[PDB]
């Protein structure tokens, strides 16, 4: 354990370089049932994470 | 003889900067499969300072 941190449509983006983990991030509310709804918007930086780990495959969990 | 630093001797490749890997994957240096049993060309993969 090297970290450990405690504090609609939403959208987020995940980046590895340089073993820095940079999680970009954004919300909207949306109303729509079929598939994500046509727009823009901008998704600012939020997180930048020093894990230097190794990354091929991820999993959500709902 | 104070042998608890290690160093990692065998890797498939170079480390990327910053990165870090603390796995202990027997390396397999020949032919002959390891099956995480370590022998000739089956090595562990850190070994100590002296
Ligand atoms: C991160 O780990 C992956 C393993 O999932 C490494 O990719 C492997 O590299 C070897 C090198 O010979 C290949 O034989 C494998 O097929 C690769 N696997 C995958 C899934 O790509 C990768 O090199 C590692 N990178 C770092 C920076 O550690």
Known sequence: ?62 | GNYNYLYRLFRKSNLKPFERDISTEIYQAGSTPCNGVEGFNCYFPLQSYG
């Open chain 1, 1 to 62: 354990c090297t970290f450990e941190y405690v504090s609609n449509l939403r959208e987020f983006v995940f980046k590895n370089i340089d073993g820095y983990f940079k999680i970009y991030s954004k919300h909207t509310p949306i109303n729509l049932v079929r598939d994500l709804p046509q727009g823009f918007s901008a998704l600012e930086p939020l997180v930048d994470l020093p894990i230097g780990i190794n990354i091929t495959r991820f999993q959500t969990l709902l």
